[PDB]
Symmetry: C5
Subunit: 201 residues, 5 copies
């Protein structure tokens, strides 16, 4: 098998529609935000403009191949793969995807998709000009799949890729997992809450 | 049947251009708005910016399957389904869809599509800075189908409204209208949603 | 015939790129604007922002069917139909289509497409803050088809928003036939005169 | 042949990806701008907002038919035709196309595509509020085809009375430029627009 | 072979999704930015608006043909070719592509794709109103391919203000390029990028 052969098979048999559940177990999706920039803060209206990498990881055995005398990885356009339907519950603009829309696929079936995203959010901005900073929370989860179909789980150094040229600095980043029951359905929907503690320089 | 088989059948036989009428009764569509945020109010020009979930529900027996040893639900890209042509009559911008465009389908043929939408409207904003608040009405209905083809009905408040908004919701009421336009002798149903809100 | 059958036939044989001329006669297109809102006026730069329904009507016998024991109308995505190539000559932005893009088709071949459109224009705005108002003209016609291929013909506050900062005093329509420097053929258009002013 | 037949044949055989060279001679493209409006001038940053028709004309024998008992013209969606890859070198926004994207095709193979375009440019704006006016130049040419594949050549009438500005004069000239990347020459047309603020 | 034949073969056999590696080696991509304009500078927020040509060059033998009595070049829509997945790491808006999306292909398999792009960046703007100017760096590299799959390198050749607009409010003092090889926290592989340093100031 060469790369040409693998990508060919993937294009033909992939099923981008079909969630890769294994035996009535959820697909375990890991989500991690790497903050890159903080752009436009408004303490009056409680809105922020963030740039971050949304590192997303899951398993899809449908994609697997024998990597014996073969490449053990390929890059695949996301249009040819199933992808989790994650959304930011407190976003007030649609995600603007800055980078090429390719996913990394390893021969075992492990997929990683890490787009860079600029997005505007609604959160608590009070104290941004204070020594203790503001704490903004971002809630991310599956939009249509409940806890028995998709589970989201958190995966560091906050500022590792954070821009030195931003007008702001990161004090701390914490992650926690929630399981919420909405008024519509009897099933639970998991999400990850990412708390970003930051202030003006 | 597994999910792969169901989604396959749906993709092949769905007929997204064809309204799923049953013996010449209307398709009963339910509409419900869940307000999430209020963003940019202008009392001078009478314009608001709202973010809301537009929960939409109807029945399409064409999609049904027998689920004896089978999943009883799947998520389907809306491009593969018939979807009601609802529009907001007093919208002054096109809907900006914030979420993935998937619908939930249950084995009986029940469909639910609930996108999160940011949209700008033209409505009565006067008194927004008052203890009694402004009351903005949003009128939503089918754009091309009359009352014998599609009927819209409200469902039988700040539950998801943002605590960080500059505004707060006082009350939300729903009522149904049946209107005859100058163009046609048929009636067109819509739902009017009254949003009572003020500045904090 | 049921709806499923008719929409199927239309999808297979419609020919969206082929103008439905009959025996060398122009397709007769009727155009009517229903004003919904006036949004952003600038008397300095002579620019207005209008929201209107662009009601467009014509005949296409290719789409006809026997409605004996059948539906006499269906809704069709405009991507599956020929549609006239109308443009606003004095528009300074592209049309923003607010509604679902469906046309109404009747069994005789009559098509009606009425999208709601927000668009910015360049026109005479002087006297907008006066008792007699400004008169803005909008010129709409076929972009590439001359008078022997497409003819356009005309058909106030009825659907105008009470919450606009402006009010409509009068709307008049007239038809022009213009010869451009490029070609010896005449191109028809409709000119719609909108007389409006600021309230209070 | 009727219109239905012609449009059918065109859809099946057109080859939009293939430049219609004849005997390895350039395709001769004619370009003409008709100014419709001038919208947002900034003398400080040297930027203007223009609305103009970009009248573009060339020949493609692949599209020809016998007109003998037939129509001699049809309208064709540009997605079904080869079209020249013209670009404005000093544009600072992408073209916003205001009109339906149809080209006019005559039975001999002559094509005309005239979209109305709103675009923002970077040019000399100084003296816009002066009796002699500013002179803004717009440079338009093929982006990827050199002078042996595509040649471009020049060819208030529709200008808005309601603009805050007026046109004093419009001149056209042709340039042939060699860039640092390739040994071939690339043709373009430079359109000089002399305009000022009204009084 | 005529143009029609070559473009036909390319459309049928091209493989846009398959990186054209040769015998286990990186695809060598060359990158060069030609600055055309500087538009909106904000020293307070450290943001600039740039227009530049992004000249990108690589080799794909899959596209080659015998040019013995034939054309030696064609223009191809990028949708029918493999293209390197380059991204600007400090961009804060998506690239706005100003030009037709065609690539130049030579019979040997050499491809050149040079779009004109308007983009907003986050960089050091301090001293823009000073005689010595600001120095803004732009970091460009492959988003998903590591150093053994794609290598990026600055162009060997020499040349800046060559296509820079005389009508900009700003002027270019100098442009330097250097290559970096970075290891990220996610993977054990190295990712190459090019860093382009743009020294510029406001005109007097
Ligand atoms: C019947 C469940 O179908 C649905 C379709 N789209 C969205 C939702 N939502 C509620 C579940 C959790 N996500 C928020 C929206 C539910
Ligand atoms: C008879 C159906 O013809 C029509 C085609 N498009 C829109 C409408 N409208 C009138 C009905 C209510 N919706 C707004 C416009 C009617
Ligand atoms: C030579 C006729 O072909 C044409 C191709 N595109 C546009 C036009 N127009 C001139 C007629 C009126 N509409 C504006 C542009 C004509
Ligand atoms: C080998 C020529 O390939 C090219 C691919 N893209 C753009 C250009 N340009 C330089 C030629 C003149 N036009 C500007 C763009 C050249
Ligand atoms: C495990 C490698 O998979 C990946 C999939 N998408 C993006 C990245 N990135 C990290 C490597 C350097 N480029 C930035 C994004 C990595
Ligand atoms: C290229 O073309 C000529 C004849 O038309 C031929 O002699 C030559 O061998 C060909 N080269 C190849 C296939 O490498």
């Amino acid at each position: 098998l060469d790369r040409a052969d693998i990508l060919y098979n993937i294009r033909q048999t992939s099923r981008p529609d079909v969630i890769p559940t294994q035996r009535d177990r959820p697909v375990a999706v890991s989500v991690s935000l790497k903050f890159i920039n903080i752009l436009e803060v408004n303490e009056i209206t409680n809105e922020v403009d963030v740039v971050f990498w949304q590192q997303t990881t899951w398993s899809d055995r449908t994609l697997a191949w024998n990597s014996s005398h073969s490449p053990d990885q390929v890059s695949v356009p996301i249009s040819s793969l199933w992808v989790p339907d994650l959304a930011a519950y407190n976003a007030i603009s649609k995600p603007e995807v800055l980078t090429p829309q390719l996913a990394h696929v390893v021969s075992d079936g492990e997929v990683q998709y890490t787009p860079s995203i600029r997005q505007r959010f609604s959160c608590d901005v009070s104290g941004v000009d204070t020594e203790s900073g503001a704490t903004c929370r971002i809630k991310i989860g599956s939009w249509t799949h409940h806890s028995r179909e998709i589970s989201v789980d958190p995966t560091s150094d906050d500022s590792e890729y954070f821009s030195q040229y931003s007008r702001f600095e990161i004090l701390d980043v914490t992650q926690k997992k929630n399981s919420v029951t909405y008024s519509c359905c009897p099933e639970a929907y998991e999400d990850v809450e990412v708390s970003l503690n930051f202030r003006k320089k």
